[PDB]
């Protein structure tokens, strides 16, 4: 799969995966106004539509993407893992996308989320 490897460094294969959502998603995505109007905000609660689900989507992607950069750092193959996406990294992080914000909850609690200010570089004042 040397040629497949070279096809793999080609990101936009993901854009093809996105259009494939239509097979399953287009079926239910009919009209879709569920309770956008009724909110007990003590009057006029019609701003309650699904803004919140946007957060889970970006989180499952971001943390997995961070887990791709962090897990690759341990390998000590910086140039290769960046130019050609390692299957184990992209698979593990992206496949655990639903449980990704969950493991991110554990990472935040364990203090794995934020690195040291001392360790981080600072520019001359």
């Amino acid at each position: 799969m040397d040629g497949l490897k070279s096809f793999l460094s080609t990101a936009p294969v993901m854009i093809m995966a996105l259009l494939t959502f239509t097979a399953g998603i287009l079926i239910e995505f009919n009209a879709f106004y569920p309770d956008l109007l009724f909110h007990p905000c003590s009057c006029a609660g019609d701003f309650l539509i699904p803004s919140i689900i946007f957060l889970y989507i970006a989180g499952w992607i971001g943390w997995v993407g961070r887990s791709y950069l962090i897990e690759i750092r341990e390998s000590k193959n910086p140039e290769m893992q960046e130019v050609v996406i390692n299957v184990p990294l992209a698979i593990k992080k992206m496949l655990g996308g639903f449980l990704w914000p969950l493991a991110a909850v554990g990472e935040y609690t364990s203090g794995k989320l934020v690195m040291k200010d001392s360790e981080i570089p600072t520019s001359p004042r």
Partner: protein, 73 residues
């Protein structure tokens, strides 16, 4: 009216970003740690180190001006 206000907020923040950055890194950055020795306004620092064009604090005001005009527009 809702949208043009946020558009203006964009206009004030980005203009402040430029002006404030250019002020803070006026003494120097890790691309030019000794910027203070060269003064406020200087051309650049040659093509060396990747390139240093429009790097000075004077050049920050310069880039900032285009955004003020736009914000006022």
């Amino acid at each position: 009216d809702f949208l043009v206000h946020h558009a203006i907020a964009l206009g004030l923040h980005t203009t402040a970003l430029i002006l404030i950055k250019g002020a803070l890194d006026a003494r120097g950055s890790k691309l030019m740690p000794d910027k203070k020795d060269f003064g406020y306004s200087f051309p650049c620092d040659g093509p060396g180190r990747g390139g240093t064009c429009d790097i000075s604090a004077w050049d920050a005001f310069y880039l900032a001006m285009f955004w003020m005009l736009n914000t006022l527009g």
